[PDB]
Tab-separated table of C-alpha atoms and ligand atoms in Angstrom:
chain	number	residue	atom	x	y	z
A	5	UNK	CA	-36.658	6.305	4.470
A	6	UNK	CA	-34.485	3.267	4.034
A	7	UNK	CA	-35.328	0.434	6.368
A	8	UNK	CA	-33.483	-2.392	4.445
A	9	UNK	CA	-30.385	-2.370	6.730
A	10	UNK	CA	-32.101	-4.410	9.501
A	11	UNK	CA	-34.071	-7.680	9.727
A	12	UNK	CA	-37.842	-7.246	9.779
A	13	UNK	CA	-38.705	-10.918	10.261
A	14	UNK	CA	-36.366	-12.183	13.043
A	15	UNK	CA	-38.152	-11.159	16.215
A	16	UNK	CA	-35.373	-8.799	17.347
A	17	UNK	CA	-36.524	-6.364	20.007
A	18	UNK	CA	-34.647	-3.988	22.286
A	19	UNK	CA	-35.312	-3.642	26.016
A	20	UNK	CA	-33.929	-0.122	26.338
A	21	UNK	CA	-36.079	2.411	28.186
A	22	UNK	CA	-38.174	4.450	25.854
A	23	UNK	CA	-38.556	8.120	25.072
A	24	UNK	CA	-41.909	7.681	23.375
A	25	UNK	CA	-44.519	5.116	22.380
A	26	UNK	CA	-46.941	5.480	19.379
A	27	UNK	CA	-48.749	3.163	16.959
A	28	UNK	CA	-47.660	3.479	13.287
A	29	UNK	CA	-48.460	1.577	10.041
A	30	UNK	CA	-44.873	0.593	9.067
A	31	UNK	CA	-41.203	0.508	10.096
A	32	UNK	CA	-40.386	3.487	7.987
A	33	UNK	CA	-42.958	5.529	9.922
A	34	UNK	CA	-41.402	4.394	13.203
A	35	UNK	CA	-38.021	5.483	11.834
A	36	UNK	CA	-39.516	8.853	10.975
A	37	UNK	CA	-40.818	9.174	14.511
A	38	UNK	CA	-37.377	8.365	15.801
A	39	UNK	CA	-35.765	11.029	13.592
A	40	UNK	CA	-38.202	13.618	14.965
A	41	UNK	CA	-36.703	13.212	18.423
A	42	UNK	CA	-33.119	14.540	18.721
A	43	UNK	CA	-32.123	11.947	21.302
A	44	UNK	CA	-33.622	8.825	19.593
A	45	UNK	CA	-30.899	6.312	18.730
A	46	UNK	CA	-32.950	3.322	17.701
A	47	UNK	CA	-36.450	1.922	17.710
A	48	UNK	CA	-38.397	-1.249	18.089
A	49	UNK	CA	-41.469	-1.727	15.891
A	50	UNK	CA	-43.834	-4.682	16.248
A	51	UNK	CA	-45.535	-6.053	13.080
A	52	UNK	CA	-48.661	-7.399	14.917
A	53	UNK	CA	-49.296	-4.854	17.608
A	54	UNK	CA	-48.006	-1.929	15.435
A	55	UNK	CA	-46.501	-0.257	18.510
A	56	UNK	CA	-43.432	1.814	17.793
A	57	UNK	CA	-40.990	2.429	20.673
A	58	UNK	CA	-38.420	5.162	20.338
A	59	UNK	CA	-35.304	4.785	22.539
A	60	UNK	CA	-32.311	6.929	23.480
A	61	UNK	CA	-29.692	4.613	24.976
A	62	UNK	CA	-27.687	1.746	23.492
A	63	UNK	CA	-29.690	-1.145	22.215
A	64	UNK	CA	-30.482	-4.081	24.502
A	65	UNK	CA	-31.348	-6.873	22.062
A	66	UNK	CA	-33.719	-9.689	22.918
A	67	UNK	CA	-36.347	-11.934	21.302
A	68	UNK	CA	-39.996	-10.926	21.082
A	69	UNK	CA	-42.407	-12.177	18.456
A	70	UNK	CA	-43.072	-9.653	15.682
A	71	UNK	CA	-40.382	-7.121	16.755
A	72	UNK	CA	-37.829	-5.517	14.533
A	73	UNK	CA	-35.139	-3.076	15.633
A	74	UNK	CA	-33.844	-0.284	13.437
A	75	UNK	CA	-31.343	2.512	13.890
A	76	UNK	CA	-32.118	6.222	13.815
A	77	UNK	CA	-30.976	5.970	10.193
A	78	UNK	CA	-29.584	3.243	7.936
A	79	UNK	CA	-27.271	5.843	6.333
A	80	UNK	CA	-24.574	5.001	8.940
A	81	UNK	CA	-22.331	2.509	7.087
A	82	UNK	CA	-18.915	2.673	8.828
A	83	UNK	CA	-17.539	-0.399	10.596
A	84	UNK	CA	-13.757	0.238	10.577
A	85	UNK	CA	-12.573	2.803	13.185
A	86	UNK	CA	-15.685	5.030	13.262
A	87	UNK	CA	-15.283	8.504	14.863
A	88	UNK	CA	-18.695	9.920	15.776
A	89	UNK	CA	-17.663	13.499	15.073
A	90	UNK	CA	-15.683	12.599	12.010
A	91	UNK	CA	-12.001	13.358	12.371
A	92	UNK	CA	-9.755	13.801	9.468
A	93	UNK	CA	-6.715	11.556	9.440
A	94	UNK	CA	-3.316	13.047	10.138
A	95	UNK	CA	-1.946	10.828	7.455
A	96	UNK	CA	-3.039	8.375	4.747
A	97	UNK	CA	-0.354	6.208	3.137
A	98	UNK	CA	0.120	3.374	0.688
A	99	UNK	CA	1.630	0.662	2.789
A	100	UNK	CA	1.318	-2.137	0.154
A	101	UNK	CA	3.536	-5.050	1.130
A	102	UNK	CA	4.138	-3.792	4.705
A	103	UNK	CA	3.314	-5.433	7.991
A	104	UNK	CA	0.972	-3.733	10.512
A	105	UNK	CA	4.063	-3.125	12.671
A	106	UNK	CA	5.315	-0.542	10.167
A	107	UNK	CA	2.036	1.338	10.398
A	108	UNK	CA	2.521	1.180	14.155
A	109	UNK	CA	5.991	2.562	13.476
A	110	UNK	CA	4.497	5.417	11.451
A	111	UNK	CA	2.209	6.350	14.335
A	112	UNK	CA	5.039	6.277	16.949
A	113	UNK	CA	7.068	8.515	14.692
A	114	UNK	CA	4.261	11.001	13.971
A	115	UNK	CA	3.640	13.698	16.582
A	116	UNK	CA	0.006	13.699	17.647
A	117	UNK	CA	-0.774	10.161	16.488
A	118	UNK	CA	-2.971	8.463	19.063
A	119	UNK	CA	-4.442	5.691	16.861
A	120	UNK	CA	-3.713	3.906	13.598
A	121	UNK	CA	-5.671	1.642	11.251
A	122	UNK	CA	-4.365	-0.599	8.489
A	123	UNK	CA	-7.107	-1.897	6.162
A	124	UNK	CA	-6.171	-3.237	2.782
A	125	UNK	CA	-3.140	-1.350	1.682
A	126	UNK	CA	-3.805	1.859	3.544
A	127	UNK	CA	-1.990	2.922	6.724
A	128	UNK	CA	-3.987	5.699	8.298
A	129	UNK	CA	-3.014	7.834	11.293
A	130	UNK	CA	-5.342	9.737	13.685
A	131	UNK	CA	-5.125	12.253	16.463
A	132	UNK	CA	-7.864	12.175	19.114
B	5	UNK	CA	14.454	-11.048	17.605
B	6	UNK	CA	11.777	-11.750	15.058
B	7	UNK	CA	12.443	-10.228	11.678
B	8	UNK	CA	9.930	-12.374	9.637
B	9	UNK	CA	7.200	-9.662	9.533
B	10	UNK	CA	8.906	-7.696	6.703
B	11	UNK	CA	10.330	-8.482	3.241
B	12	UNK	CA	14.095	-8.955	3.158
B	13	UNK	CA	14.405	-9.398	-0.605
B	14	UNK	CA	12.273	-6.600	-2.164
B	15	UNK	CA	14.597	-3.617	-2.142
B	16	UNK	CA	12.410	-1.580	0.233
B	17	UNK	CA	14.277	1.307	1.817
B	18	UNK	CA	13.123	4.307	3.825
B	19	UNK	CA	14.314	7.868	3.212
B	20	UNK	CA	13.576	9.139	6.711
B	21	UNK	CA	16.331	11.100	8.448
B	22	UNK	CA	18.408	8.937	10.680
B	23	UNK	CA	19.278	8.888	14.351
B	24	UNK	CA	22.266	6.615	13.884
B	25	UNK	CA	24.272	4.694	11.302
B	26	UNK	CA	26.311	1.483	12.032
B	27	UNK	CA	27.389	-1.629	10.122
B	28	UNK	CA	25.898	-4.927	11.416
B	29	UNK	CA	25.951	-8.585	10.228
B	30	UNK	CA	22.156	-9.146	9.969
B	31	UNK	CA	18.685	-7.575	10.126
B	32	UNK	CA	18.097	-8.852	13.592
B	33	UNK	CA	21.196	-6.978	14.781
B	34	UNK	CA	19.916	-3.798	13.130
B	35	UNK	CA	16.608	-4.340	14.935
B	36	UNK	CA	18.507	-4.708	18.189
B	37	UNK	CA	20.292	-1.442	17.512
B	38	UNK	CA	16.962	0.192	16.881
B	39	UNK	CA	15.532	-1.119	20.169
B	40	UNK	CA	18.515	0.350	22.033
B	41	UNK	CA	17.432	3.843	21.037
B	42	UNK	CA	14.181	4.991	22.713
B	43	UNK	CA	13.120	7.100	19.746
B	44	UNK	CA	13.856	4.556	16.936
B	45	UNK	CA	10.672	3.641	15.065
B	46	UNK	CA	12.058	1.690	12.154
B	47	UNK	CA	15.255	0.837	10.347
B	48	UNK	CA	16.693	0.222	6.950
B	49	UNK	CA	19.334	-2.497	6.598
B	50	UNK	CA	21.213	-3.156	3.359
B	51	UNK	CA	22.243	-6.774	2.548
B	52	UNK	CA	25.319	-5.793	0.420
B	53	UNK	CA	26.704	-2.769	2.170
B	54	UNK	CA	25.636	-4.043	5.660
B	55	UNK	CA	24.834	-0.483	6.758
B	56	UNK	CA	22.077	-0.242	9.318
B	57	UNK	CA	20.162	3.061	9.563
B	58	UNK	CA	18.049	3.728	12.609
B	59	UNK	CA	15.226	6.279	12.142
B	60	UNK	CA	12.769	8.120	14.380
B	61	UNK	CA	10.025	9.505	12.140
B	62	UNK	CA	7.405	7.800	9.979
B	63	UNK	CA	8.728	5.639	7.227
B	64	UNK	CA	9.322	7.101	3.765
B	65	UNK	CA	9.398	4.024	1.524
B	66	UNK	CA	11.370	3.874	-1.697
B	67	UNK	CA	13.365	1.419	-3.829
B	68	UNK	CA	17.070	0.825	-3.280
B	69	UNK	CA	18.884	-2.361	-4.193
B	70	UNK	CA	19.585	-4.617	-1.205
B	71	UNK	CA	17.505	-2.616	1.338
B	72	UNK	CA	14.981	-4.007	3.730
B	73	UNK	CA	12.890	-1.998	6.178
B	74	UNK	CA	11.793	-3.321	9.546
B	75	UNK	CA	9.860	-1.893	12.462
B	76	UNK	CA	11.211	-1.316	15.956
B	77	UNK	CA	9.584	-4.675	16.697
B	78	UNK	CA	7.486	-7.195	14.770
B	79	UNK	CA	5.439	-7.821	17.947
B	80	UNK	CA	3.002	-5.045	16.883
B	81	UNK	CA	0.162	-6.987	15.200
B	82	UNK	CA	-2.927	-4.718	15.398
B	83	UNK	CA	-4.543	-3.432	12.207
B	84	UNK	CA	-8.141	-2.702	13.316
B	85	UNK	CA	-8.543	0.542	15.340
B	86	UNK	CA	-5.128	0.575	17.066
B	87	UNK	CA	-4.748	2.911	20.098
B	88	UNK	CA	-1.062	3.532	20.810
B	89	UNK	CA	-1.580	3.771	24.558
B	90	UNK	CA	-4.060	0.952	24.654
B	91	UNK	CA	-7.491	2.057	25.780
B	92	UNK	CA	-9.993	-0.284	27.170
B	93	UNK	CA	-13.335	-0.286	25.406
B	94	UNK	CA	-16.326	1.252	27.123
B	95	UNK	CA	-18.375	-1.576	25.781
B	96	UNK	CA	-18.057	-4.878	23.899
B	97	UNK	CA	-21.245	-6.447	22.531
B	98	UNK	CA	-22.487	-9.324	20.425
B	99	UNK	CA	-24.133	-7.620	17.520
B	100	UNK	CA	-24.625	-10.797	15.389
B	101	UNK	CA	-27.142	-10.103	12.643
B	102	UNK	CA	-27.062	-6.296	13.108
B	103	UNK	CA	-26.096	-3.604	10.660
B	104	UNK	CA	-23.202	-1.198	11.412
B	105	UNK	CA	-25.846	1.513	11.902
B	106	UNK	CA	-26.976	-0.157	15.133
B	107	UNK	CA	-23.433	-0.076	16.467
B	108	UNK	CA	-23.445	3.594	15.510
B	109	UNK	CA	-26.703	3.793	17.450
B	110	UNK	CA	-25.039	2.193	20.476
B	111	UNK	CA	-22.276	4.798	20.413
B	112	UNK	CA	-24.716	7.763	20.106
B	113	UNK	CA	-26.630	6.385	23.049
B	114	UNK	CA	-23.573	5.753	25.247
B	115	UNK	CA	-22.188	8.733	27.165
B	116	UNK	CA	-18.495	9.169	26.449
B	117	UNK	CA	-18.459	7.185	23.204
B	118	UNK	CA	-16.252	8.955	20.686
B	119	UNK	CA	-15.550	6.013	18.331
B	120	UNK	CA	-16.976	2.612	17.459
B	121	UNK	CA	-15.734	-0.442	15.563
B	122	UNK	CA	-17.735	-3.363	14.210
B	123	UNK	CA	-15.566	-6.324	13.140
B	124	UNK	CA	-17.138	-9.711	12.749
B	125	UNK	CA	-19.938	-9.884	15.216
B	126	UNK	CA	-18.524	-7.525	17.795
B	127	UNK	CA	-19.713	-3.942	18.321
B	128	UNK	CA	-17.104	-2.168	20.375
B	129	UNK	CA	-17.320	1.324	21.869
B	130	UNK	CA	-14.423	3.650	22.849
B	131	UNK	CA	-13.865	6.891	24.662
B	132	UNK	CA	-10.855	8.985	23.619
C	201	YIO	O1	-42.560	-5.126	20.996
C	201	YIO	C1	-42.798	-5.487	22.363
C	201	YIO	C2	-42.125	-4.436	23.202
C	201	YIO	O2	-41.846	-4.792	24.588
C	201	YIO	C3	-41.630	-3.554	25.360
C	201	YIO	S1	-42.164	-3.785	27.148
C	201	YIO	C4	-40.198	-3.213	24.802
C	201	YIO	O3	-39.514	-2.215	25.574
C	201	YIO	C5	-40.364	-2.776	23.320
C	201	YIO	O4	-39.206	-2.282	22.687
C	201	YIO	C6	-40.833	-3.934	22.488
C	201	YIO	O5	-39.811	-4.933	22.375
C	202	YIO	O1	20.510	1.537	1.999
C	202	YIO	C1	20.862	2.741	1.305
C	202	YIO	C2	20.483	3.879	2.212
C	202	YIO	O2	20.332	5.187	1.584
C	202	YIO	C3	20.423	6.225	2.628
C	202	YIO	S1	21.140	7.815	1.923
C	202	YIO	C4	19.006	5.991	3.272
C	202	YIO	O3	18.599	7.056	4.144
C	202	YIO	C5	19.046	4.627	4.014
C	202	YIO	O4	17.912	4.308	4.786
C	202	YIO	C6	19.209	3.506	3.028
C	202	YIO	O5	18.033	3.355	2.223
C	203	CL	CL1	-35.611	-10.336	7.301
C	204	CL	CL1	-33.455	-13.396	24.402
C	205	CL	CL1	-21.185	6.748	7.056
C	206	CL	CL1	1.935	7.217	-0.412
C	207	CL	CL1	3.637	12.196	20.471
C	208	CL	CL1	11.089	-11.627	1.041
C	209	CL	CL1	10.701	4.573	-5.580
C	210	CL	CL1	-0.274	-5.944	19.443
C	211	CL	CL1	-23.779	-9.286	24.620
C	212	CL	CL1	-21.926	12.169	24.818
């Protein structure tokens, strides 16, 4: 279980109410505990105390010595327009050399388009 | 009327079916014609012929000598996760030093969150 996506040595804890507390030998075991609970979104593991705290809600970051905070999984890589349920674009177009406004124009002119993104040279259209 | 957002000298036309054809003296007048029609999304104006073609649907770019293609307005600047109707985020958080996966985690753990974006240091949560 990949635990490289988050800092282990920066004292980052989360105050969110927990679902479960256990003691485990490493961060990867805490992650595994989190994955075993359907509703666990993230976890705080403490290096010194070895307590592992599984949590459901959104993180509430704060500083506590020895803490590290990891997601349910590090597999989640998306940062640009990230639909939780996935959602296939209505349209994906090469808009090299075009302003954002013309991707806006494409969305206005496409029935069902609620949202557009323009990263790099790609104009991409979505329906809710 | 700002027409700087698009190339004037690169022979970029659009094949989309038109709403209206007129002759005008400049690109800014073609833009003005487009704005006068509720359904105009973009326009192609030709430098040599001076024909201005107002269009409703999504652009269909192609090469034609003297063409330029402009949006309804250049005011539309958004490129990152652009909701046509606007849509205020459910949540906006400082996630400095966090992987995308923890913004994913925030969305999972927030009732109503359908979509997240993580640009710079900001984790931002949306409902449809
Ligand atoms: O590690 C110390 C510990 O403090 C408790 S009370 C928090 O809720 C945990 O997530 C963790 O940060
Ligand atoms: O400018 C020549 C002209 O060609 C017609 S037939 C297209 O639909 C116009 O948008 C424009 O590209
Ligand atoms: Cl580290
Ligand atoms: Cl703090
Ligand atoms: Cl992913
Ligand atoms: Cl294309
Ligand atoms: Cl529509
Ligand atoms: Cl130019
Ligand atoms: Cl072409
Ligand atoms: Cl804007
Ligand atoms: Cl904050
Ligand atoms: Cl939900």
